Amino acid sequence: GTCTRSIPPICNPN
Amino acid sequence: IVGGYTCGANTVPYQVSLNSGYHFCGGSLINSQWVVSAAHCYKSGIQVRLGEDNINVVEGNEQFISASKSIVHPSYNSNTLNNDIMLIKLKSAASLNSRVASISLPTSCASAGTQCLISGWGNTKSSGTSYPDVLKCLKAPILSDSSCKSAYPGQITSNMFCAGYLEGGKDSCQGDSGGPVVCSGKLQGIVSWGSGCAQKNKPGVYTKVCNYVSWIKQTIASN
Ligand SMILES: [Ca+2]
């Protein structure tokens, strides 16, 4: 569920 | 920025916006020709926008300068986000003034509890999306290493630190990546990642700039 804070976010399954 | 406040025009004169036909990340001006941002903000065609307040209106004091070099840390790991740092060389030097100014690099790492200024044009909502026109600001403390690691087990490298508020409500967010965390007048952090935004027990995670001062200097000197 964790994501980078970019537009768009790059996210992990967690 | 969630739970922050309007900075005021050009009150954060090192803050830049990275633009590819839209704002997608922040960055920090560290001299007239070089910007620090996050490695995960890398793309072709970056235009650096300096002196910005309202990013949707030409107000005066803007400088738009193309990136001529976008240098991701060679050991950036896109899955762990270790070494999430990028150096951008401007195609021409920015004109430095009161509204466009560089921020100093650290001479030593910062300590837990020190108050820092985090800024950007990212989402201002922790649920849903609302993107501001003008630059937003947040005062936030550096958290202890044990608290950071307890919040994000197995995920915090020595090149990261946590900052913010475990009670929720105040944080950086999508669109703030690459922008500054400035503590005692030094660039100590780069907005990087987190679980959601402004969620309880999930602070922001930031690239630890003090570990990269030598790499930054050596990379600039050879480019
Ligand atoms: Ca503008």
- Judge if B110 and B8 occupy the same domain: yes
C-alpha–C-alpha distance, residues B90 and B171, integer Å: 29
The neighbour count for residue B56, using CB atoms within 10 Å, is 12
Q: Record the tokens describing residue A14, joined without a space.
A: 């967690």
- Judge if B79 and B5 occupy the same domain: no
Distance B16 CA to ligand 1 centre (A): 11
In B, minimum Cα distance to A9 occurs at B174
The answer to whether the beta carbons of residues B116 and B188 sit under 8 Å apart is yes
Chain B CB within 8 Å of residue A13 CB: no
Q: Do B24 and A10 touch (CB under 8 A)?
A: no
C-alpha–C-alpha distance, residues B136 and B122, integer Å: 8
- Judge if B110 and B166 occupy the same domain: yes
- Judge if B178 and B206 occupy the same domain: yes
Give the experimental resolution in Å: 1.9
Q: Do B176 and A9 touch (CB under 8 A)?
A: no
Counting one residue from A and one from B, how many pairs have CB atoms under 8 Å apart? Answer: 53
C-alpha–C-alpha distance, residues B121 and B110, integer Å: 25
- Judge if B52 and B142 occupy the same domain: no
A contacts of B152 (beta carbons < 8 Å): 2
C-alpha–C-alpha distance, residues B34 and B90, integer Å: 6
The answer to whether the beta carbons of residues B171 and B198 sit under 8 Å apart is yes
Where would I find the beta strands (DSSP E) of B76-170?
Answer: 86-90, 115-120, 136-141, 160-163
Closest CA to B210 of B161, B172, B156: B161
Domain count, chain B: 2
Q: Say whether B19 sits in a helix, a strand or coil.
A: strand
Q: If 0-12 CB within 10 Å is exposed, 13-18 middle and 19+ buried, where does residue B220 land?
A: middle
Q: Which residues of B105-133 are buried (b: 16+ CB within 10 A; e: fewer)?
A: bbeeebeeeeebbbbbbbbbebeeeebbe
- Judge if B90 and B107 occupy the same domain: no
Q: Say whether A13 sits in a helix, a strand or coil.
A: coil
Q: Which residue has the tokens 């994501």?
A: A3
Q: Domain span at residue B75?
A: 13-102+211-222
- Judge if B110 and B1 occupy the same domain: yes
Checking chain A for breaks where C and the next N are over 2.5 Å apart, the residues before them are none
- Judge if B197 and B108 occupy the same domain: yes
Q: Record the tokens describing residue B217, joined without a space.
A: 């200097």
Distance B62 CA to ligand 1 centre (A): 6
C-alpha–C-alpha distance, residues B169 and B73, integer Å: 32
- Judge if B6 and B65 occupy the same domain: no
Phi/psi at B69 (nearest 5 deg)?
-140, 135
C-alpha–C-alpha distance, residues B78 and B155, integer Å: 13
B173-to-B102, B112, B123, B133, B176 alpha-carbon distances in Å:
23, 21, 6, 15, 6
CATH of the domain at B53: 2.40.10.10
- Judge if B111 and B187 occupy the same domain: yes
Closest CA to B209 of B41, B84, B47: B84
- Judge if B128 and B139 occupy the same domain: yes
- Judge if B35 and B110 occupy the same domain: no
DSSP β-bridge partners for residue B183: B116, B186
